[PDB]
TrEMBL record, chains A, B, C, D:
Recorded family membership: Belongs to the aldehyde dehydrogenase family.
E.C. no: 1.2.1.3
InterPro entries noted in UniProt: Ald_DH/histidinol_DH, Ald_DH_C, Ald_DH_CS_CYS, Ald_DH_CS_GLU, Ald_DH_N, Aldehyde_DH_dom
Encoding gene, per UniProt annotation: HEL-S-53e
UniProt keyword annotation of NAD present: yes
Domain Aldehyde dehydrogenase: 22-485
Active site: E262
Entry GO CC: cytosol
Keywords recorded for this protein, A-Z: Acetylation, NAD, Oxidoreductase
GO molecular function: aldehyde dehydrogenase (NAD+) activity
Originating species: Homo sapiens (Human)
Catalytic class of the enzyme: oxidoreductase
Name assigned to this protein: aldehyde dehydrogenase (NAD(+))
SUPFAM superfamilies hit by this protein: ALDH-like (SSF53720)
Amino acid sequence: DLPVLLTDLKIQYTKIFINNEWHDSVSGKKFPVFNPATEEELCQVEEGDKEDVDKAVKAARQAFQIGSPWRTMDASERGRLLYKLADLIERDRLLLATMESMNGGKLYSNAYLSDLAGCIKTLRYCAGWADKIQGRTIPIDGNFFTYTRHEPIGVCGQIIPWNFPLVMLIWKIGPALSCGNTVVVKPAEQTPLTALHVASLIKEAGFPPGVVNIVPGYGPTAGAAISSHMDIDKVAFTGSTEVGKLIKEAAGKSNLKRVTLELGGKSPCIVLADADLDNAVEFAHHGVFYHQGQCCIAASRIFVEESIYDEFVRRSVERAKKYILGNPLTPGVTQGPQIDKEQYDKILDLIESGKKEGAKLECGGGPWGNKGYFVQPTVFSNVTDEMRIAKEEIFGPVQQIMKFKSLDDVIKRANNTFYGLSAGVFTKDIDKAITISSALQAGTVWVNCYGVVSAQCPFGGFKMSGNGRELGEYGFHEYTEVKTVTVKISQKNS
Amino acid sequence: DLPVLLTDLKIQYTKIFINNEWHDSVSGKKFPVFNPATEEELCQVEEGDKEDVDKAVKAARQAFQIGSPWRTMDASERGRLLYKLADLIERDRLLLATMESMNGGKLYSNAYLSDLAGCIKTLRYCAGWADKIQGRTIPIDGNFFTYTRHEPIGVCGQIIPWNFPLVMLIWKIGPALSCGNTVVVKPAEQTPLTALHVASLIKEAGFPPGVVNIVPGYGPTAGAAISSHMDIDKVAFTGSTEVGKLIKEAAGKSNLKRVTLELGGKSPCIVLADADLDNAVEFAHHGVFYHQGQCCIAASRIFVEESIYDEFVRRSVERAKKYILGNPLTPGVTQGPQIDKEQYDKILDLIESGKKEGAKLECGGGPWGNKGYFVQPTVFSNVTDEMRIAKEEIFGPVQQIMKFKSLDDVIKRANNTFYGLSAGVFTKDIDKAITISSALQAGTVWVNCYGVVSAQCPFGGFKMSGNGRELGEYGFHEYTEVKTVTVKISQKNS
Amino acid sequence: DLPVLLTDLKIQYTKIFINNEWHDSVSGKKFPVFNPATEEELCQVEEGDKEDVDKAVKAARQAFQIGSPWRTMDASERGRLLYKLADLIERDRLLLATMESMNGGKLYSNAYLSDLAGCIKTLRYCAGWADKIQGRTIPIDGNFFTYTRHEPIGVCGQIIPWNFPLVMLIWKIGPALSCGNTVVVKPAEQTPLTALHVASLIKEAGFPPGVVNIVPGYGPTAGAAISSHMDIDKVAFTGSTEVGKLIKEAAGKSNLKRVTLELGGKSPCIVLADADLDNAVEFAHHGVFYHQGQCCIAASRIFVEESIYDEFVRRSVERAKKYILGNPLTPGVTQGPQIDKEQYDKILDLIESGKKEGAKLECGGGPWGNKGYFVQPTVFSNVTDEMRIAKEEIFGPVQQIMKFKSLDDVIKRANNTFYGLSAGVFTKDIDKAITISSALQAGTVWVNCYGVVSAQCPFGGFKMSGNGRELGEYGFHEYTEVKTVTVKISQKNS
Amino acid sequence: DLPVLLTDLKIQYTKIFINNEWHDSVSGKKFPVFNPATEEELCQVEEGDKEDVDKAVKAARQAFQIGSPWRTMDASERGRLLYKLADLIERDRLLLATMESMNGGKLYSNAYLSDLAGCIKTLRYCAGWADKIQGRTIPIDGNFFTYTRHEPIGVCGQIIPWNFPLVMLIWKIGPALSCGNTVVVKPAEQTPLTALHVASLIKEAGFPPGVVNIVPGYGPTAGAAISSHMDIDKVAFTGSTEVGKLIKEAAGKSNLKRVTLELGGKSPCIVLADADLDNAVEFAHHGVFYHQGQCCIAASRIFVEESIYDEFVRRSVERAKKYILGNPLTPGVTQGPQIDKEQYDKILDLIESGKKEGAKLECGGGPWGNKGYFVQPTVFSNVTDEMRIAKEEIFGPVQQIMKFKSLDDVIKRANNTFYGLSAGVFTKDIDKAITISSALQAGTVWVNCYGVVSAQCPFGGFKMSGNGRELGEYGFHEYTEVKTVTVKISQKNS
Ligand SMILES: C[C@@H](Sc1nc2c(cnn2C)c(=O)n1-c1ccccc1)c1cccc(O)c1
Ligand SMILES: C[C@@H](Sc1nc2c(cnn2C)c(=O)n1-c1ccccc1)c1cccc(O)c1
Ligand SMILES: [Cl-]
Ligand SMILES: [Cl-]
Ligand SMILES: [Cl-]
Ligand SMILES: [Cl-]
Ligand SMILES: [Yb+3]
Ligand SMILES: [Yb+3]
Ligand SMILES: [Yb+3]
Ligand SMILES: [Yb+3]
């Protein structure tokens, strides 16, 4: 069932959120937020800069002080607040999905059924962990009692991307808050709006002031202020590998703050001759085209064994030809726009390289419409490994399909990238499934599926696709700081 | 490579081992130990009874007292002693394998290459855990510091079976000692000898006195004294399901001591039409015939899909016809005797039921030789589920082969037993492998193999095949007792 | 704040609960439920016997079948149902606390503020674990992929005591359901009513039918049917050590079902001369007198260093003299009745032994009132270790206070019992706190407090005070059954 | 007992170690290694540069390839090799301690009894973990089987400091190898020699070639080549905070390699009025003066409550006056030299600042001897927080003693530093011990002791004292890379 908002959406929250109150920018400057489907301005939002990041950090630091409400409340109560926040997001599901669709260029059906479902479920998952973060008692050598505390790290700067604004906001704040940290969030300049609504709900839920502070603004200004701040303990970032390198560099230069990155990919699929063919076609298809290709896990290199290659390419192309482009709020529409001009240009440029470097254009390959940043869904076959479309993350609706005959070699080709976020293996053979997935240098390996993400699983990159993991049990480690306490005693006993 | 002992084996250790010294029995009675291959007496061993179990428990209790060397030594040093003991067993590998072969009716090749390899490796595995047993620090509600201690339980009574005397001795003492317990071991009346050599090595390694006490004797006398003792904290037993019920009952009646049991099985294999056929034949074959069928995991019901049933039965029968019976010390011999008269009779009785109830005898089905408890390797095809050979653990070289056509039904037939130790699934299909192994009510499920046991894996039964698990991380839990310590504090912080 | 029910309580649910529907007993027999404060009958409830336990188990078995809604739903959804059930109990907090107070003889203030708070919080804690129960992937020797599944065990029989009916119901069903088990609950014959209301709420929450079945009735009839059933996989019991031995025995006799017991105690406190004296008095006081002494953890032996003994005894006695006896529903009342005749008699009998064996009666020592099972709060000083009041669990408002001068000896006296549920240590000295708590043979050791119980902590007995642990991470282990799956592969890699 | 080497030490291993063979440098250049006690050259060692780091990385990459001996061997066998290496280091204990003493300026007694003991024990600890590194099976939403692999990361660059060359070498390679990584080690330019002997032993133990490669040389040349290499997956570094920032920056600039740092400290002790005074004096003394102050954990700010300050300062000063300076190989000598000119100058410079800024010089404060880099043991009292000696890591035998009267304020002063490696709390009060240790922003907090380090504990910095943890269970996480494998299945069951 797909319900809708009965009256039109009004924008209410447009200010900087610090100590549970709404702040004008220090400068007094504001910046426009656009609908990528119409290119029309939706509203103006307060432009956070370094001076506003400073206010946000001071508030987060104060909320983190020993003896504060957030440090002293029961872990179970941190849990409770997070589950309350999930209930509120569920209450505002229609509003949030519509705002997400409108600001983010994201299909409403997907926004409502997937993004918001995952956002609520992931919050509820994280809430459950709050009072289950535990240290150890350790049988050290000598006459000592040794225990560890898995403390919160402290003030965590969190830079959110534009492709999944609500989901990524919750991936960040959910674990960070469950573990007892305070946060300074910088949502994407393209998509500040849903985060600012969430801030209103954080206040409503009863989080102590200063526990969550949200500072909208640009990357090079507010994002740089976060990455180079001398009193931010950790920075978490999702986005391009380029900006990832600037984050990690600036942390080293400033205060050696902890860094976790989720960056791009050039994720491969290997489709064996014995695979369920239309399952492999359908998952590889959705693997690359989901949300206009604007997924870090985009299945952007599909290697198919020679004897099934032609049939795979054909079936893929007919699937790509079924889309309806338009406003992502209109029902029946199955593909929205790209997020902005910068991305739009980058995609069309890379589409042209495929043409010039000699890939076989099967369909698409140009723009669409009078307004909006729309790219026709594009499929290239006979792609080769030194092509630009095979090396660079497109972040657009552009599928690459390659052939292989040797399994040894295709694994090398799959692994021959600086990326390593994810990969897909399609086969019916037990041994192939286990051995190939083990050999791929990818953080998530899907077998006979693609793009299956859930709160219970850790998620992140090998190589230049990232540092660290988010979600699962394992992801919660990176929002704690471990303290060993070693107490002299007269005599220990086992 | 298979080296041998250059001079003949002499028996040295035949006494009760308490506080690292050798004790005559309280009564002064001794009991004979036999070679099952010749039916000839090997030696006399001191007969432990209730009165000697009492001395052993008092010594174990004293070695466990707060402030004792065993309670106060570094965990890492418990580890060190265990790795030292492994080195000593490796030094005496030839001696121990020969004694194991001679007393246990066990093929020397297997004794030397498998039993002793596994015994050494499992000890070394357990040694590694000693200083890695850890409790927790817990974010309890209220202003409290809460931690847990994973303490040793205390005095652990450990009753060892005759089928794998050295291996099972080490499965018991390795984890128990790693965790800091003291032990009173009662090796099988049939096979006391290798345990008594190990005791000599425990002394040599430098274990504090009273940490390991070994009391040979009979089950109904010494084993009952252990199970009903008022100062034994835990009993661990491997053997028949019948005796398992008496152990668990007597613990309840006496002092509610902790109980873990590894009992029999009637373990099924399901062989799908798509399986690698000779791999399935070879593993199912070794699955049921290993060590004269005297394995709790014996693959004693092999269900084979109809279309490959005849070929499976044929190939199986030709494999069963390749054996050479005789003294397990002679090279080239590939099948030794059964352990004793009691077992020998039980097997022949059950072979006769198969005949009378209408199973198709494919080969074997009677005794062998002038001396020794030898049973011809026996294969029955067209076995049905209400036959005695399909319901009762034979513990002999007797294979049952059934047919099936429906996967739903064969899973019900596989699960339709009070047993549940293990099972085998043979297929090339990923989905079948995962779904079938999930649906089987068996503690270990092997896929495209059988009888793969290693120290890193937990091992134990569903249903009446046992309570608890041994080895792996998980098995170490059952040799600890958890204490929660909750300290009032003025103010907690996360 | 202490709100109350605005109209009088009516009893609605009095039937056996199986497959989410209300059943008359097979026999058609009913049994009375009494108010212990008035000795007046509250209602009649359907008397479950063996024949009704059988219906309940068959339903639980069907709800557990592979492919059923409960086996196939997401773990996260098991979590969701449990948090929903907590919300419903919170909605019915007034009703449930009043019914709990009225049926259980339990002070309303305590019922509302403590029992119901803990019940809701513990459910919410358990809900959080549902999708965080995980197995392992294990680096086994050889070319194999090995993983473990921490499966639900299956049908769990759960026998609930009368002292904390709602709390203990939730301690049982919360973990059992979180882990995926189905349950057959037998609440206490004295206190069936609040469990039957909870059943109505389980239906309301949307649990699949057969996942929770509640069968009220007597112990020797319905409780024995559970303990000896051939298709119940596990039994969990809280109550007397006497009945605990019968449970464990019958499990051994029937189907070797898994057993966990939380039994009585004779829990000691050691109060050092340097202790905060009135903190030690107040906690030791509440430690023994809470809920009319009807706590398994009753601090029923208080050892106080000689130099502070007289002052401790005096201060204790003046605290014991402050109580107001009466109907536990009336405000200002600070002590309700004992649960029934059987318990009432047992307490008065033991009070008389203290007198006859020569303890110094400081106050109390007889009955109270015209109606109700009231015992005056009783304090004995100069108690010695062979007295009946020092050895036997009274389960009544009867405090024992002893003296000691040697720390070595008082620890031996503390540990010189077959019990071992809990203990208390009162001192300002770091080393004493750590060394004493380590040396006590007690499952929970409180330091400078007593009776601090929370969902995040494991809880259970050493020795004859129990087998296994409930709650915490550690307690969830005993509601799983571990399966090892070992898959043959061509080549493994680390 | 302190045995010694019976003949004089000869230096044998002086070459670059790659693929288990000894390599001359690509350039052919060599660099001198000095004895800091005599300032005399001990030998020449091959100077590794970028070109030699490249050979080492290519070899490590090849040893890490899927299907290689190191990737395919049993985890238990990785364990075995590590325990074998420990046995070899134990065999060469005299040789290694003497070489360590001679090259490192380290007291022989300490080298033999502490450094080598810890090195052997830590290796044995790490060996135990090898086959106990496990992933998870995870109850993901939807019809999927999800598991994780805790894989080795790959090629790990490891830069070792000069203060504890053998110990730090083993802290690095032990966990890295246990987890299955290959390593390129760059020992300190001052202290290459003991690492090169260890390399000879790695070959002897039977490690596959390319698993450990050791490249001696300078920091700015070989260390920079490691930190900026495009095919090194992780860098681990121990040393100054200054160089730590350059490492973390260069990783960000090159290939976003994983980074863990153990950096300097300015570690505080808080000594309460109720503390055991001479225990606090003795531990705080050894806390700052151990190994000529060249410990990252140096207790370099000792805050003492006013009423015990004078007595503490006095007692401290008399302890500092007991030392005998000289060659660290001569028996009875209790203080050796500083490591080199650079460090020597830095210490004397900072000693002068204490004088000029107005600290009270209690003893020491200048150089010692005709040869060697000796600094007199120096004590400053009445130190204040803006003094250079209170802010900067001296890394020399220079003690700072401060006074405080307010506990709130002294905690702020303790925490008012960019450092945060460790701290010490001295008190008899339970509550103070727990609350203060919780409030300190330090990775290890010792209570009534100092400098207690063991393999079972995680160790590392808060703030600019480091990123990540070494040793313990927790430290092993940072030598794994987590892969999630999610397999589509027809139907899951719990
Ligand atoms: C000796 C084996 S255990 C083993 N190996 C077998 C059985 C049937 N076929 N094979 C090859 C078999 O039944 N076992 C066994 C023995 C006792 C308890 C459980 C299982 C072993 C391996 C690794 C470690 C260890 O301690 C023991
Ligand atoms: C109601 C308490 S349990 C509790 N609180 C007590 C006892 C004696 N004094 N106090 C204050 C006490 O005995 N219990 C208790 C009840 C059943 C089993 C074990 C312990 C609670 C707290 C948190 C969670 C929960 O489920 C229950
Ligand atoms: Cl994981
Ligand atoms: Cl496990
Ligand atoms: Cl625990
Ligand atoms: Cl830890
Ligand atoms: Yb345009
Ligand atoms: Yb005969
Ligand atoms: Yb009466
Ligand atoms: Yb000089």
